[PDB]
Amino acid sequence: NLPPNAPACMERQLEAARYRSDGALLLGASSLSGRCWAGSLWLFKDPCAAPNEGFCSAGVQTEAGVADLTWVGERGILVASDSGAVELWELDENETLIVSKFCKYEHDDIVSTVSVLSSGTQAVSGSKDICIKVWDLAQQVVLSSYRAHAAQVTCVAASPHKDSVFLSCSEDNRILLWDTRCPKPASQIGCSAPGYLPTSLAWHPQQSEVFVFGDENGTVSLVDTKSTSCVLSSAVHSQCVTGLVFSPHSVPFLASLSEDCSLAVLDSSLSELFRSQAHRDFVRDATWSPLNHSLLTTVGWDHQVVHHVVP
């Protein structure tokens, strides 16, 4: 059986995989080829049934493609769209449908990265239009708009606990540390060398002054904000690092994504513990199960949902 207003077909290119604190799986997918270039949002209360369409809890189709996604609590879905819009999709009371709360066209090009700030009432979006926008999710408006960068914004990552703080990186070779509290909010941080372009950002979930970034040449970097001259880095991938996700563990593992179609799992020293070649196309997301902490669920452009067992 298929839920109401949901299509019987799923878009081949899987963009985002996000677990809710209960364990239900959020899927964002785009049609990147063929006649129709659109997107969709899917919910799976049974995560082992995904990617299969006729065995979902909820499903909706968007006008344009899904470049990025984030949970807004337990019933909210914040969408980075090709349309230049930031979309907030409100979940149903019975959690059967996915209904459009707001769709605002503020960015002048594809919105590529979205991150919800620690309060859950504010969010930051990064776009190909080179802008960075701070959003108020209740009033459905842009609070602040920053042209800090000189090239397309690749990754915006909100800090774990400060609403003022978020990282951003761009094809202009800048990693910017932000604090909405300063009159000049952004601050250029990173390694001594200019190196390769920054592609992915992830804060440490415990050390609040520490983060990790992946470059376009497959190198993962461990950076402390204070020292501002990178401590440790390993060449984890043969191609661009798409995403970096820390495990929910008190002592966390780092999941490394790539266009080399592999997933790697690393420790504190960035050493390789696990690697999966399960995917036949680009690895686009990773989420660890809130329930089984040793489980890691990846999605790819090969329309595969691979559930991993990390020891």
Binding site: W37, Y105, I110, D172, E216, N217, C261
Partner: protein
């Protein structure tokens, strides 16, 4: 009206999206031909064997629609000048694939960005595509007026924006373009899509794009202000630029999402049409010139060639020209015969090169106006023109006019003249051989005789125009020097160009020439002070003439005789363009040379660098004596 298009980097259903933009009032659409986010791999397995389709089918539009309504767009992940080998290699293959798909589709144009200094490998890959079969497709290089790094918000505390003026730095985007089009060897198929931002740069920066092949202007919604009634409008400075760009007949492109959500997307368009309809009207010169803009013509040689009937017709529909000739004759006759002699002293007036007779009639209207007596002689070498003259002499003029069917240099006159009148001038004054003709004629002028015109001077000005250089470069003919097209002047209504310095007088001739040893050969050195950074492509020539006293004719822009749409400026190209820095002087040498059979010009730039001497011995160009 206005040729305008819509820029979209998001098209979910190609058929629906096209109808919507046509409904809004757009003549075309700029869109991706592969999904912008859809990165393809060409070397490494498993991503290399990604199953198809790789984009949407060509069957989704008619051939006509692809040919006329769709401008293709390069995918933004394609970076042929990336510092990462792997990315460079995939971007090359991806660029070829998308460019070849655009060619397959039959697209009229395709957009590629210049968003950084180094675009060498992008230029290499485009050049190789351009030489892979002969096609008519155009390439639009998306360049901003202001680099994004120079317009960023001053919000990075440890990396502030440079407030210090950097004259050359503010023109960096022109250098990105110049290098790219130099590397691509000035392909006629490569043009500019000039992206205009919120805050315009210095006037000098906007002045660099003078003479450049601007085919499209990109206006983002972000740059439109909001008027009191909520409509999108532009700053007075932004309006000036649009007015300057309408003259270039560019296609305007609207990019970005709608920020005037109260109104529709035709709102941004309606402002452009409104601005289009509210421009200072095209004057008699601007209206006549329409169609001839930067169109290269050969200078007339009416001595060597017998002009066709319709050439005479063009240079007759100029009443200002013959009002001034009439006035110069009127004023001369009064100075030669006083009121007491107004019926005893009859003046020998010779029209030398009478054409179809408008100068003859002008000498008639100037005899009755001055109420003085004249005996007219109408000399003309062109026997076909003499047909029109001899029919005029029979049907209207009568015994007053004596038509002479001869060249003025070979004619034996029965009596000496009081006034010899002629229009033997061209766009560079002496370029139709007025000195030589009038020297061969002054023997039959009285010792106190008047020549109308009595003096003429040519002027030169250095110009920049990569459009006109390319236009010339295209004039190669088989069975002649592959470079002879740069060693000849062109009559051209100079349009898309930049005058680098004030016109300065070159060669002057006076009539009659009282010199015991008359020499029509010349050598002139000019020093043109340049206050811009530019590229010199050639020299525009104009003239000035004194018919009689204060009565003059001019095509020098400063002193232009108003209404004289007849004469267009001449262009003297140079084989190789020359970089000129701000503060430098352009020094040019010009010679007027001759032998018994022919006359020609030779020219060379000596400063800031040397050129070759152009047209040595009249090898590429001569004026037949």
């Amino acid at each position: 009206r206005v040729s305008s298009g819509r820029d979209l980097n998001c098209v979910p259903e190609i058929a629906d999206t096209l109808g919507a933009v046509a409904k809004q009032g757009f003549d075309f659409l700029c869109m991706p031909v592969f999904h912008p986010r859809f990165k393809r791999e060409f070397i490494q397995e498993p991503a290399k064997n990604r199953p198809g389709p790789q984009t949407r089918s060509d069957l989704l539009l008619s051939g006509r629609d692809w040919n006329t309504l769709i401008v293709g767009k390069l995918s933004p992940w394609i970076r042929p000048d990336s510092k990462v080998e792997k990315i460079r290699r995939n971007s090359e293959a991806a660029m070829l694939q998308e460019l070849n798909f655009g060619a397959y589709l039959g697209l009229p144009a395709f957009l590629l960005p210049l968003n950084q200094e180094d675009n060498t490998n992008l230029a290499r890959v485009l050049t190789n595509h351009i030489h892979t079969g002969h096609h008519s497709s155009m390439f639009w290089m998306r360049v901003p007026l202001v680099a994004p790094e120079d317009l960023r918000d001053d919000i990075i505390e440890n990396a502030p924006t440079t407030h210090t003026e950097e004259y050359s730095g503010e023109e960096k985007t022109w250098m990105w373009w110049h290098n790219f089009r130099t590397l691509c060897d000035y392909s006629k198929r490569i043009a500019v899509a000039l992206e205009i931002g919120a805050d315009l740069p210095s006037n000098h920066v906007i002045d660099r794009w003078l003479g450049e092949p601007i085919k499209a202007a990109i206006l983002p919604t972000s740059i439109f202000l909001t008027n009191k009634k909520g409509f999108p409008v532009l700053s007075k400075m932004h309006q000036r630029l649009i007015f300057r760009l309408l003259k270039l007949e560019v296609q305007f492109i609207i990019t970005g999402t709608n920020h005037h959500s109260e109104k529709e997307f035709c709102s941004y368009l309606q402002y452009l049409e409104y601005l289009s309809q509210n421009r200072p009207p095209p004057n008699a010169y601007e209206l006549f010139a329409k169609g001839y803009e930067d169109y290269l013509q050969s200078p007339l040689q009416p001595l060597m060639d017998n002009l066709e009937s319709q050439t005479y017709e063009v240079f007759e529909k100029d009443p200002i020209k013959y009002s001034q000739y009439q006035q110069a004759i009127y004023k001369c006759l009064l100075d030669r015969v006083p009121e007491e002699e107004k019926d005893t002293n009859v003046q020998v007036l010779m029209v030398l090169g009478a054409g179809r007779g408008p100068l003859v009639n002008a000498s008639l209207r100037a005899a009755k106006q001055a109420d003085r007596r004249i005996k007219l002689y109408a000399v003309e070498k062109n026997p076909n023109a003499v047909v029109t003259l001899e029919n005029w002499q029979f049907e209207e003029w009568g015994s007053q006019v004596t038509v002479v069917s001869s060249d003025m240099r070979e004619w034996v006159a029965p009596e000496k003249a009081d006034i010899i009148v002629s229009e033997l001038l061209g766009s560079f004054a002496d370029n139709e051989l007025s000195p030589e003709c009038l020297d061969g004629a002054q023997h039959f002028l009285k010792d106190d005789g008047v020549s109308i015109p009595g003096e003429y001077t040519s002027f030169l000005a250095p110009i920049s125009s990569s459009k006109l250089y390319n236009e010339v470069r295209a004039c190669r003919e088989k069975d002649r020097d592959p470079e002879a097209q740069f060693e000849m002047p062109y009559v051209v209504r100079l349009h898309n160009f930049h005058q680098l310095s004030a016109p300065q007088p070159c060669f002057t001739f006076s009539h009659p020439n009282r010199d015991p040893m008359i020499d029509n050969n010349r050598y002139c050195t000019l020093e043109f002070p340049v206050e811009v950074n530019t590229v010199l492509h050639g020299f525009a020539g104009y003239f000035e003439t004194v018919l009689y006293q204060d009565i003059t004719l001019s095509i020098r822009p400063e002193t232009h005789s108003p209404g004289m749409f007849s004469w267009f400026p001449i262009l003297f190209p140079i084989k190789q363009p020359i970089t000129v820095r701000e503060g430098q002087t352009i020094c040019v040498r010009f010679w007027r040379c001759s032998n018994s059979k022919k006359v020609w010009y030779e020219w060379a730039v000596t400063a800031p660098v040397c050129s070759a001497i152009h047209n040595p011995t009249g090898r590429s160009y001569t004026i037949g004596l």
